[PDB]
Amino acid sequence: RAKFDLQFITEEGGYSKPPNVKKLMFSDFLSFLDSHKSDYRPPLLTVP
Amino acid sequence: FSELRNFFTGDVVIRDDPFDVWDGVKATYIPIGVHGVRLDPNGDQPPL
Amino acid sequence: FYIVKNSGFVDRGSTGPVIASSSVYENVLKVVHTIADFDAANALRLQR
């Protein structure tokens, strides 16, 4: 089960400053599983 | 002289680099897995 | 949720409202492994 954090970005058309998009890496998922290894009921992953 | 040597001849085998020895370890166990709800097997108990 | 090597979605030149995204569309994914539940995902993380 997971929650997804939605975010909207408007592309004006001027390709000067690249937007900063939040990306979630595999590394982060492992870091998650290790902070909850002992939990006695599944934790919630917030996926952006 | 030969015989005197052959008497005082005996071999030994030793490890080139000494073993690296450690201390014991405190065997600590931690919880794992998720637990669900288990309902009583007999159901409601008789009155009084 | 899906785990994947790399992804994104750019639809340049489109006139639609969506032209980019941190994610992709479902039909573009090929599922080659399926992790059943939190437990199992956690279990795999621990088999070193």
UniProtKB/Swiss-Prot annotation, chain B:
- The lineage's top-level taxon is Viruses
Location(s) in or outside the cell: Virion; Host cytoplasm
- Could you describe the subunit structure of this protein? Homodimer. Homomultimer.
Per the record, the similarity remark reads: Belongs to the phytoreovirus inner capsid protein P3 family.
Instruction: Report the function annotation for this chain.
Output: Capsid protein which self-assembles to form the inner icosahedral capsid with a T=2 symmetry, and consisting of 60 P3 dimers.
Q: What is this protein called?
A: Outer capsid protein P3
Give the originating organism. Rice dwarf virus (isolate Akita) (RDV)
**Range covered out of full length:** 972 to 1019 of 1019
UniProtKB/Swiss-Prot annotation, chain C:
Q: Which cell locations does it reside in?
A: Virion; Host cytoplasm
Q: How does it assemble?
A: Homodimer. Homomultimer.
Q: What does this protein do?
A: Capsid protein which self-assembles to form the inner icosahedral capsid with a T=2 symmetry, and consisting of 60 P3 dimers.
| Family membership noted in the UniProt record | Belongs to the phytoreovirus inner capsid protein P3 family.
Name by which UniProt lists this protein: Outer capsid protein P3
Q: Whose protein is this, by species?
A: Rice dwarf virus (isolate Akita)
Which residues of the full-length protein are shown here? 778 to 825 of 1019
